[PDB]
Amino acid sequence: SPGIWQLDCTHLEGKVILVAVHVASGYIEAEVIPAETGQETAYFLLKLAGRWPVKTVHTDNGSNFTSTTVKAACWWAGIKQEDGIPYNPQSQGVIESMNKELKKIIGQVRDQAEHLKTAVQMAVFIHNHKRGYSAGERIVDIIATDIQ
Amino acid sequence: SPGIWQLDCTHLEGKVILVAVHVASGYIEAEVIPAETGQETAYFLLKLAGRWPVKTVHTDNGSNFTSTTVKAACWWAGIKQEDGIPYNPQSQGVIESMNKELKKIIGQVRDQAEHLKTAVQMAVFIHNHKRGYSAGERIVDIIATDIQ
Ligand SMILES: CN(Cc1ccccc1C(=O)NCC1CCCCC1)Cc1ccc2c(c1C(=O)O)OCCO2
Ligand SMILES: CN(Cc1ccccc1C(=O)NCC1CCCCC1)Cc1ccc2c(c1C(=O)O)OCCO2
Numbered sequence: 651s652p653g654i655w656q657l658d659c660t661h662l663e664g665k666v667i668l669v670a671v672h673v674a675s676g677y678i679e680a681e682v683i684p685a686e687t688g689q690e691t692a693y694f695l696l697k698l699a700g701r702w703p704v705k706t707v708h709t710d711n712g713s714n715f716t717s718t719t720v721k722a723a724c725w726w727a728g729i730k731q732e733d734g735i736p737y738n739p740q741s742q743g744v745i746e747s748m749n750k751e752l753k754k755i756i757g758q759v760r761d762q763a764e765h766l767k768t769a770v771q772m773a774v775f776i777h778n779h780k781r782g783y784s785a786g787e788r789i790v791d792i793i794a795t796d797i798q
Numbered sequence: 799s800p801g802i803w804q805l806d807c808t809h810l811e812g813k814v815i816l817v818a819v820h821v822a823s824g825y826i827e828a829e830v831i832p833a834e835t836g837q838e839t840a841y842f843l844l845k846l847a848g849r850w851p852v853k854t855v856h857t858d859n860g861s862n863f864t865s866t867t868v869k870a871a872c873w874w875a876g877i878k879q880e881d882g883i884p885y886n887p888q889s890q891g892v893i894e895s896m897n898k899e900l901k902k903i904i905g906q907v908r909d910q911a912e913h914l915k916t917a918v919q920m921a922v923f924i925h926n927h928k929r930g931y932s933a934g935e936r937i938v939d940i941i942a943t944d945i946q
């Protein structure tokens with residue numbers, strides 16, 4: 651559980667927002683890309699695994715589960731690649747709610763930048779800092795406890 | 799000290815590698831950009847502060863210290879912007895050694911990707927995982943202790 655992440659893809663302004671969520675804490679990382687490809691997903695995972703101890707990634711769809719480039723990034727980074735089937739149905743709702751919340755925050759900051767990528771990083775900041783612990787505090791505490 | 803980071807700019811393949819180092823742990827984040835501008839530095843700091851609790855950033859040069867866009871990103875993210883003058887002379891050497899080490903790692907992975915950005919993220923991964931604790935373990939432990 652300290653090492654489990656979930657990929658999530660949502661759309662805004664004709665672009666794709668790729669999100670990785672640390673399941674146990676709700677902490678997120680995100681980026682803006684023109685379209686979701688295996689190559690871009692692979693690169694996103696390489697970045698993620700260099701920054702946090704990623705043991706397992708539940709992929710966001712079957713195309714990314716199948717992608718040889720995504721499989722190659724998971725091999726490279728020592729990540730167990732898994733499907734994202736919501737065997738627990740509450741998983742769908744949680745991700746849906748998170749996407750709605752993210753878009754709401756993006757709307758609240760949207761006029762503070764020209765480019766969507768900038769607004770998305772402001773939204774990541776606000777989400778991770780919101781408290782009563784924050785998601786950012788929770789992920790560090792969870793991982794630190796696991797190390798000790 | 800848990801919240802203190804240092805910016806660092808190095809060059810490879812006619813491009814710029816922008817690095818943020820967590821001073822107490824040696825943990826790094828990095829990106830590749832065509833050239834170091836205030837805007838790109840500002841965006842890099844916004845990303846960093848959404849991911850880690852950044853209290854203070856020592857800027858890499860006077861242009862980034864002066865930059866109104868960098869100052870604006872520091873204001874936005876609640877970061878104290880400081881100079882990077884090595885009042886302790888060993889600071890120069892440490893950064894110089896880190897850049898040499900990074901470039902060595904990049905050379906060791908360079909043929910595993912077409913694009914420099916990919917090789918840089920592999921290098922970040924290897925640096926942060928190298929042990930006997932790793933930099934990634936150190937940063938989490940330092941910040942977790944501070945939270946509690
Ligand atoms: C040049 N932009 C001016 C601007 C334009 C429109 C509205 C507000 C502002 C404004 O000054 N925002 C306040 C402040 C908020 C904290 C972050 C820094 C900007 C901002 C900007 C800076 C660096 C970038 C950008 C962008 C962008 O416009 O998206 O895009 C990606 C590449 O790095
Ligand atoms: C398409 N590339 C094929 C390739 C080309 C040359 C040498 C090796 C390989 C190769 O297959 N490497 C193994 C593996 C290593 C772990 C990561 C996934 C690739 C790799 C690649 C994937 C995603 C990207 C890339 C790149 C890139 O080439 O830089 O660039 C930035 C955008 O996301």
Ligand SMILES: [Cl-]
Nearest residue numbers: 666684685686
């Ligand atoms: Cl798409």
Ligand SMILES: [Cl-]
Nearest residue numbers: 814832833834
């Ligand atoms: Cl430059």
